[PDB]
Symmetry: C3
């Protein structure tokens, strides 16, 4: 069996057409003493990354700000900050409520 | 790593499922459809969202506003989902593959098909 | 191909304050006579289990009532009430709307 904790967040950005992006992050690991990893630590890691894009024009930070590339970047940034016994499992980024990009490791 | 684009849409249809040899009472729902297409991120894209949505909505269009018991012998959520999956697969460009189809009958009950 | 039916339900419970839990259960099996498993039957099985949690003191049942442990608790009792030809595929438990645990078999 595989266990994961999920956190959902959102941020607004433009690329120009501004959107409200909904981000879902799934971190996989083992349930140790009732916890995989506390939600607040993960959520802090995630927001610390999304805040760099919040209210910005992604065309100034990304060569080509496609939802896929933004999702990719976010995944790499998250990966670099997660704790030792945990892995980035899934990243789902919705460009508005009806369209999204799912990245699964 | 796998990369997919997801497109969400909805359509409404009325129907009654078989409860033995006889039928339940007819009623309508808003169906929520989630389609996941997997492929490689080329030039920053897997597949254009709108291109996928059009393929999917042309399909749901045949079900939209219709009595499903007139289209399916047994309009269960699984048979409808299967039918949608097959229709989509048949229309997808040669560089992607149908990965997932999630059909919700309302927001409380749904069927998930994965390839 | 794999086919699953999914049911969503909700229950409120207190532990340590109280929360509104959102549960999503996915059952994998083959489609026979047009369906994997009757939606109501699963819903019955699931809500009979959640009924034992509804507005309860979770610390009376769990030494450490974390979201993960509660998810494991539910996953197990569901596996014990399921019919012979289907399998518990996934359990997603959201404590509130933006934080959840996902168990996958
Ligand atoms: C009230 C809330 O349930 C409590 O603060 C927390 C915090 N962080 C958590 N983190 C995890 N992984 N699992 C949990 O159940 C909780 N619960
Ligand atoms: C406004 C619209 O969202 C934008 O032009 C698009 C269109 N199609 C897309 N298609 C993919 N695959 N990824 C994207 O980020 C976008 N963005
Ligand atoms: C009204 C209700 O949705 C209808 O009677 C049901 C019940 N159980 C079901 N169970 C499955 N597996 N698939 C379905 O479409 C339904 N439909």
């Amino acid at each position: 069996m595989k266990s994961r904790i999920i956190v959902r967040t959102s941020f607004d950005a433009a690329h120009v057409h501004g959107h409200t992006f909904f981000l879902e992050v799934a971190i996989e690991g083992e349930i140790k003493n009732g916890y995989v990893m506390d939600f607040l630590e993960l959520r802090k890691i995630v927001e610390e990354i999304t805040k760099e894009l919040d209210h910005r024009n992604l065309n100034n930070i990304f060569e080509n700000p496609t939802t896929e590339n933004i999702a990719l970047w976010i995944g790499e940034r998250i990966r670099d900050k997660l704790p030792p016994y945990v892995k980035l499992k899934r990243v789902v980024l919705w460009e508005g409520k009806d369209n999204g990009v799912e990245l699964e490791w």
